[PDB]
């Protein structure tokens, strides 16, 4: 887990090999690429309740709001499953209003 100990970037595993009077290591590393940059926000408050992401980050391509992990990009719609509520949006800086979907009401009708 300690960075830049063996490899360059995120380490996965290594193989040892012999040598005349030494040893040789073959590290395997994982490196991201093909970047994009979007508009973000710290937390989303709906109906006076400020939902925060469990693990990940909010992003937006311009017209919709999604939650994605940090080291890879895949969009998931926002529901009350992957977000948790704490307080109200009156002191956090950068809150953006929106709507949050829930499954219980559609599945209860």
């Amino acid at each position: 887990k300690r960075v830049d100990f063996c490899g360059k970037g995120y380490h996965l595993m290594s193989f040892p090999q012999s040598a005349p009077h030494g040893v040789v290591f073959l590290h395997v590393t994982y490196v991201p690429a093909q970047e994009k940059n979007f508009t973000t926000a710290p937390a989303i408050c709906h109906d006076g309740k400020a939902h925060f992401p469990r693990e990940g980050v909010f992003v937006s391509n311009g017209t919709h709001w999604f939650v994605t992990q940090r080291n890879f990009y895949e969009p998931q719609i926002i529901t009350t499953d992957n977000t948790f509520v704490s307080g109200n949006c009156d002191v956090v800086i950068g809150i953006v209003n929106n709507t949050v979907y829930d499954p219980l009401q559609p599945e209860l009708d």
Binding site: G9, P32, A33, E35, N37, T40, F52, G94
Partner: protein
């Protein structure tokens, strides 16, 4: 690791708190206090040195 990627500072500190166990709500509810404490500490280290 690779190419540098921009990230606002508030979310970087939120991630760094989330790393050590404390949830990320603490930073977003106590931003001004933390900023003032950090400024005071970095001011006093100057005089101490």
């Amino acid at each position: 690791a690779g190419a540098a990627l921009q990230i606002p500072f508030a979310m970087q500190m939120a991630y760094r708190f989330n790393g050590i166990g404390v949830t990320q709500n603490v930073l977003y509810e106590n931003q001004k206090l933390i900023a003032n404490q950090f400024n005071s500490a970095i001011g006093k280290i100057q005089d101490s040195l």
